[PDB]
Amino acid sequence: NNCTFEYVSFKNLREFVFKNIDGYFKIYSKHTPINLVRGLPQGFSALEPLVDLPIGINITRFQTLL
Amino acid sequence: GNYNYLYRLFRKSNLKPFERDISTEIYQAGSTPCNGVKGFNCYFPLQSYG
Amino acid sequence: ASVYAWNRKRISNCVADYSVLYNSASFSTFKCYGVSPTKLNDLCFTNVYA
DSSP states (O other), X not given: OOOSOOOOOOOEEXXXXXXXXXXXXXXXXXXXXXXXXXXXXSSOOOOEEEEEETTOSOOOOOXXXX | OOOSOEEEOOOSSOOOTTOOOOOOOOEXXXXXXXTTSOXXXXXXXXXXXX | OOGGGOOOOEEOSXXXXXXXXXXXXXXXXXXXXXXXHHHHTTXXXXXXXX
């Protein structure tokens, strides 16, 4: 219920940024391949804008699905 | 009076730009937390123009 | 006073701690119009009439 929006489109690192300034919730992302290491890679990357979602809510907690 | 329309008369702090707030939690103006029930300085936060 | 001939006290040249009034839980009713009780103690006026 209350879906204001719906959409359908260790070697990999997926990166995201979540920002909640004024109207609606901004999301940016990138993908890069990496070496099989527990730490983040030293080579530079930049994240590209995706969406500004109609959630309207502050957000304070989150999780990942395996 | 038409009582269907409401405005929030009380809140803990001012809304940020385009912040939106449905919450009906009792506003504590009083000395003591209100346990989710009305009382002296324990106000219901939405009021009608009527 | 009798209500057909009510008494007005003019209030001036003094500090109005309205919290002395609105925190008085002995009162059978408190209401306020144009101002929330927690905001009253910030305001200033030329005269007040009780």
